[PDB]
């Protein structure tokens, strides 16, 4: 996949984002931006460009579902990846996360080694 592929890096922890970003850019992706909730995520996306949404699932005023209902349901980019992030597994979440659209999700925390195996899956099921 493209390299400089556009990621948008959502969560309500400044610190979370900052790990996300540094395992990001150990597996060659540097061109990261960040947003701090669903409806922040959302504004960032309409200034346009993105390729990829990495989010997490518990955030305020819009959570993760949300924001991934949001994105599916727009016209320009409901095709946009988007990884989701939760700190635990949860049936429910999961069935919920996948009938909404979402591209894959991953357990924080999480190693560079796992965050690129799920970008590749996704990569490949999508055929970038």
Do not use: C, H
């Not at 890096?9 to 790990?19: A, Q, Y």
Request: hydrophobic share 45%; proline share 2%.
């Amino acid at each position: 996949a493209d390299k400089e592929l556009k990621f948008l890096v959502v969560d309500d922890f400044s610190t979370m984002r900052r790990i996300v970003r540094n395992l990001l850019k150990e597996l060659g992706f540097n061109n990261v931006e960040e947003a701090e909730d669903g409806v922040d995520a959302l504004n960032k996306l309409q200034a346009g460009g993105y390729g990829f949404v990495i989010s997490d699932w518990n955030m305020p005023n819009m959570d993760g579902l949300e924001l991934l209902k949001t994105i599916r349901a727009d016209g320009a980019m409901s095709a946009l990846p988007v990884l989701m992030v939760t700190a635990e597994a949860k049936k429910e979440n999961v069935i919920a996360a996948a009938q909404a659209g979402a591209s894959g999700y991953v357990v924080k925390p999480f190693t560079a080694a796992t965050l690129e195996e799920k970008l590749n899956k996704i990569f490949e099921k999508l055929g970038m």
